[PDB]
Amino acid sequence: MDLIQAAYFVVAILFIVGLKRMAHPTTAKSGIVWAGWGMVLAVLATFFWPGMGNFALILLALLLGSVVAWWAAVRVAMTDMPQMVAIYNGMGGGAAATIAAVELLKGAFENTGLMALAILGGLIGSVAFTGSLIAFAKLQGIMKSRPILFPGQKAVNALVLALTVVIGLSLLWNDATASIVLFFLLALLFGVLMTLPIGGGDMPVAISFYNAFTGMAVGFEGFAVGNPALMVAGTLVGAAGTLLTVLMARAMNRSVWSVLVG
Amino acid sequence: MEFGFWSALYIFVLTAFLGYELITRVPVILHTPLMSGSNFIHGVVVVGAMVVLGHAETGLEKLIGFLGVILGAANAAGGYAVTVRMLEMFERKP
């Protein structure tokens, strides 16, 4: 507990300084390096979580995802870097949801307010996930670039979101394993629906928006389960990410709401 | 929030103020690399997914916890790689 605490703490200082340095011209190159060590320290230190098992599945999954991902990033043309940022972002959010989802269906929550936090992070995660994939698809030409519009869409979107929130709250009284898969389907479903109307040209602001969204997703997820490394880094990026989205929109001589709609 | 409700709320808001604050005064040329690095940083989701996986029973929990770690690992690995390549655009040639 106390050496993990100590490690995860130094990890925050490494992400804070790293993010701090990524933001200034002379110091940008080191920033990613500092944050890098942050990750390393964090990934090692978490091996010593008490009650830790399934190590083969763990080593498999770290190895599988980290390498295939690295492989892709290195081969891609500089011209496709926006969608790469998108798709790695999506999966960050998917992870936020998986954390939520597992804990939710061991119903491992005593505090119902923590449960609520977890569910909120699940919803936001799931949205970022499929939201960032639609973004990718569009850039890659796998889908229509321009706003995918239809009859009374505004209403169907609000409706799914409303339905999702609602059946989400449901898990506080009844946490039936059927309600959980429904909750996530709807959260993933609302992810896609949210981004159909977003034009390819606005995609930089959508992606910055989803980046804020998964950051927030993971900070919430971190508070719900007792994990400081997520709590800090999560909200650090959620907060910096929303500001970034404002500045990116401003720069593109246009507004965030506009991006979201048609 | 957790580990002292007030304790945690102070952390939440301070971290949020601090995060927001570091990014003010960022230049335009650094927008997207900043996005990539911050995207890389929420790559710590692995750590959380890792713990979910480590304690998983029921097998469903292992499956979905297994995906969690893959997804989380690519976010960190891929985000790191991508940020590094963007930063190489600023560099001269000889």
Of B30, B18, B28, the residue nearest A249 (C-alpha): B28
Question: Hey, what are A154's tokens?
Answer: 């505004």
Question: Hey, what are A131's tokens?
Answer: 């939201």
Q: Can you list the alpha helix ranges (DSSP code H) found in A141-262?
A: 153-173, 177-195, 203-224, 228-251, 256-260
Contact map slice: A 144-203 vs B, CB within 8 A: none
A78 touches chain B (CB under 8 A): yes
Token look-up 């959980």 returns A180
Question: Hey, what are B17's tokens?
Answer: 């103020």
Distance from C-alpha of B65 to C-alpha of B67, rounded to nearest angstrom: 5
Contact yes or no for A94 and B52 at CB 8 A: no
User: Residue A190: CB partners within 8 Å, gap ≥ 6?
Assistant: A126, A127, A157, A160, A161, A164
Of A107, A81, A149, A148, the residue nearest B87 (C-alpha): A81
Question: Hey, what are A119's tokens?
Answer: 């569910």
Sign (positive/negative) of CA torsion A215, A218, A224, A225?
Answer: negative
According to the annotation, is A254 in a ligand binding site? yes
**What is the residue-wise DSSP string for A41-77?**
HHHHHGGG-TT---HHHHHHHHHHHHHHHHHHHHHS-
B31 touches chain A (CB under 8 A): yes
Helix axes B31-41, A2-22, angle to 10 degrees: 170
Distance from C-alpha of A217 to C-alpha of A205, rounded to nearest angstrom: 18
Token look-up 């097998």 returns B59
In angstroms, this model's resolution equals 3.1
Distance from C-alpha of A131 to C-alpha of A259, rounded to nearest angstrom: 14
User: What residues of B are in contact with residue A88 (Cβ under 8 Å)?
Assistant: 39-40, 74-75, 78-79, 82
Contact yes or no for B67 and A99 at CB 8 A: no
Distance from C-alpha of A77 to C-alpha of A142, rounded to nearest angstrom: 17
B10 touches chain A (CB under 8 A): no
User: Residue B20: CB partners within 8 Å, gap ≥ 6?
Assistant: A239, A240, A242, A243
**Method for structure elucidation:** X-ray
Q: Is A12 exposed, middle or buried (0-12, 13-18, 19+ CB in 10 A)?
A: buried
Token look-up 């800090």 returns A232
User: Residue A135: CB partners within 8 Å, gap ≥ 6?
Assistant: A83, A86, A90, A195, A198, A203, A206, A207, A210
Domain with A94, as residue range(s), is 1-262
Question: Hey, what are B35's tokens?
Answer: 């996005």
Domains: count for chain A = 1
Distance from C-alpha of B47 to C-alpha of B64, rounded to nearest angstrom: 15
3-state secondary structure of A127: helix
Contact yes or no for A23 and B33 at CB 8 A: no
Helix axes A2-22, B5-23, angle to 10 degrees: 20
A32 CB-side CA count, 13 A:
25
Q: What is the CA radius of gyration of chain A?
A: 19
Of A47, A64, A7, the residue nearest B73 (C-alpha): A64
Distance from C-alpha of B80 to C-alpha of B88, rounded to nearest angstrom: 13
Of A238, A20, A8, the residue nearest A120 (C-alpha): A238
CB-nearest partner of B2 from A31, A82, A223: A223
Contact map slice: A 15-44 vs B, CB within 8 A: 15-16, 18-20, 22-25, 28-29, 31-32, 35-36, 38-39, 42-43
When scoring A85, A112, A130, A136 by the number of chain B Cβ atoms within 10 A, the one with the most, hence best to mutate, is A85
Distance from C-alpha of B42 to C-alpha of B58, rounded to nearest angstrom: 28
Distance from C-alpha of A108 to C-alpha of A51, rounded to nearest angstrom: 15
Question: Hey, what are A204's tokens?
Answer: 């930089």
A77 touches chain B (CB under 8 A): no
